[model samples]
Target: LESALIGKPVPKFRLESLDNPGQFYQADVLTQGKPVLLNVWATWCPTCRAEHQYLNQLSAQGIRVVGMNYKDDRQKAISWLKELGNPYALSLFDGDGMLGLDLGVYGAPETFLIDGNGIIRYRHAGDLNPRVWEEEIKPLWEKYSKEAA
Candidate 1:
């Protein structure tokens, strides 16, 4: 999916927020005019747990990290974020995995690096750490940010 979708526009998706149903539109893809880490995660996913702290670290460093609460209970997801700490600027609720399927997500813990222009620059289908960020994500983020600036 990453190979096929890279360099193409992300499929237009508007998922509701698990936390703010009335304001979910604020979480729309590519609307922020910056590079975004569109991460798929769930409260039940162990791998997602492993990467949560780094995701928050990335956010703390000014990265635009957004989340998809894939196929998760709304209450649990909300509770999980409260317990684990919320890294995302906003989080989309994907309880049915509809958005996940559309984005070609085969499992939890996949991330798409979508640029300001809505093009997907990269995709990583596993737990994201500092090493992965430096090796795979940072380069493209730098390239795109330079062009945008």
Candidate 2:
């Protein structure tokens, strides 16, 4: 796994959002302000399912989860989302896997934590098992949320 991205600026990204359908997304660091949990995953992956409900719960709390659907058929992905319930604020189609490669993602179930400053502060390379978020992500959110306040 690539370890060089920690403490570095997140790569600027603006892929088409499936949730929005055909709209390009270039996030603003200021007004579009908030920490983001970018989940790189697929419907077929079992690990993605493991934390899907937790993701939905977080979404309910106003946390935005931007889904990066790994190389899967668009119809299947959409159908899966419809069936399992989409927990993301936005879903981007990564049909070609180029987006994943640019971010150094080797496969599905990877997650990137991008703070309000748009700097990617953390990278979890596999499924986020229970307690991992409390240990890693929650602290950062508390830190940044307080600082912003």
Candidate 3:
């Protein structure tokens, strides 16, 4: 399933930002000369809670991490982010799950590593721990960084 998306352009989407209701098309930031980590999560997911801090660490290290808030109530999502501390630079609200369906999302806590050209380079469908980042995502990021340079 993940292989199908690798080397292919990301599915086009224009979701409203979770933090700012009036904002739209913010996901286009993926194409702006930096690889991005799109972490699909919801306020209701326990696994998301476990990995939230790690994502924040990535963002603190200057990684461009975006959140795909899937199938959740707006109020709850906002409160969750406020309580947990938002790791995302910007978050897309997929309240009705349309964007998730479009992206072939089976469930929450999936992540996609997309290149600067809007192509997805890799997909990780579970908790993004240090080991996984080092063993899997880091290699791809290194390759993408060299290629982009």
Candidate 4:
């Protein structure tokens, strides 16, 4: 329903990485001339698990996948990643959900696609099922991947 973000540049973000105390900044990475996929999720959610698995598959294609860890403890997040096999390139610890709010995040398990120019070109809400990704995310990637190249 919130299509406003589509075609708009995403807000800037700097978040702590789940693995270490060191900060991970978006500006540093978004400028690298490639598309970015940001998946907002939580440890307790089953939907998140499904999406995370496919995301791991998606990551092997060489695209950087960033995670916005929603309202979770750092240890829990790290443990979940270790247990599930971390698909995220580096997760942004959204411990208190403030950044999620700033991004207008309504709930756990939303995926945002940022083009190589850093515009928020697509969004997949709820879960990342095969039908949705094939229908939605893949086309955006194909579009921008071709355009940017």
Provide the RMSD of all predictions against the true structure, rounded to 1 decimal.
1.7, 2.2, 1.4, 1.6
- Comparing 1 and 2 on TM-score, the stronger one: 1
Against the hidden reference, what TM-scores do the models get? 0.92, 0.87, 0.93, 0.90
Predicted candidate 1 versus true structure: per-residue lDDT over 1-149, tens digit per residue: 35678888877666787798665553345656778889999878898888999898888888888888999989989988999899888888888898788788889889999988888888898889988989999999888887777
- For candidate 3, the lDDT comes to 0.84
**lDDT tens readout by residue for model 3, 1-149:** 36577888877777888888788874466786778888999878888899999888888888888888999888998998899798888888888898788778889889999988889889888889999999999899878867876
Flag regions of model 4 displaced more than 4 Å.
none
TM-score (C-alpha, index-matched) for candidate 2: 0.87
Q: After superposing candidate 1 on the true structure, give the runs of residues whose Cα lies further than 4 Å from its correct spot.
A: 26-29
TM-score of 3: 0.93
Query: After superposition on all CA atoms, how large is the RMSD of candidate 1?
Result: 1.7
Candidate 2 residue spans exceeding 4 A from truth: 27-31
| Over 4 Å off, model 3 | none
lDDT of each: 0.84, 0.77, 0.84, 0.80
lDDT of 4: 0.80
lDDT-based ranking = 3, 1, 4, 2
Instruction: Compose the digit string of candidate 2's lDDT tens values, residues 1-149.
Output: 44577766666666776656778766452123677888998877888887788888888887767888998778888887888789887788888887778788878799888777777777888887558788877888778666655
Q: 96, model 4: CA deviation in Å?
A: 1.8
Quick one: best lDDT, which candidate?
3
